[PDB]
């Protein structure tokens, strides 16, 4: 006779896939970049 069994497993709370990590990394990087560049533009324009 066939000896078979079935069962179920529920998993959750996946952190994030790759695009979420990529997006948050590039978002922080460009936020720092635009802040430092706004400081650059403000300083160099106020010197002028």
């Amino acid at each position: 006779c066939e000896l078979s069994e079935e069962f179920q497993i529920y998993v959750d709370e996946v952190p994030l896939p790759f695009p979420g990590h990529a997006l948050i990394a590039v978002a922080t990087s460009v936020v720092l970049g635009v802040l430092i560049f706004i400081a650059f533009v403000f300083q160099l324009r106020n010197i002028h």
Partner: protein, 146 residues
């Protein structure tokens, strides 16, 4: 898990985690190309009296058959028993509403198999080779064996 807490669905392992999950109505497991577009053609907690969740797209519209809870009106109408609420088997999933729960990383889950043979309980033997399969075509589970 005790049966009274299986009825209640409020289990906590002294750590703030729920061990039992009550499935959403008309639940369908996801597919490979997306976790929001089911393509499994199997219905969990099935109920034709309610709108179907997460069922846009033509292929997902074209998939999903109601086996037990057919055109028979509702969940309260399509009839199930305790043997159908505690069944983990395919085609008994139309009224499958409570399942277990886990974290995301599940490592070394023990797959233990016992054989009944009319006087005691034995373990599965190396003469009795084993095949593993998933009923919902998923490719995100791996096995460790010696």
């Amino acid at each position: 898990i005790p049966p009274e807490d299986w009825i209640s669905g409020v289990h906590k392992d002294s750590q703030g985690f729920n061990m039992i999950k009550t499935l959403p109505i008309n639940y369908r497991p996801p597919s490979h190309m997306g976790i929001s577009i089911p393509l499994t053609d199997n219905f969990y907690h099935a109920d034709p009296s309610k709108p179907i969740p997460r069922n846009q797209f033509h292929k997902s519209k074209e998939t999903g058959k109601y086996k037990q809870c057919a055109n028979v009106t509702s969940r309260a109408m399509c009839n199930c028993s305790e043997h159908q609420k505690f069944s983990h088997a395919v085609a008994f999933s139309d009224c499958k509403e409570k399942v277990h729960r886990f974290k995301f990383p599940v490592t070394q889950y023990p797959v233990v198999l016992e054989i009944f043979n009319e006087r005691d309980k034995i373990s599965a033997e190396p003469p009795y080779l084993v095949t593993m399969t998933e009923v919902n075509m998923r490719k995100n589970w791996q096995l460790k064996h010696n």
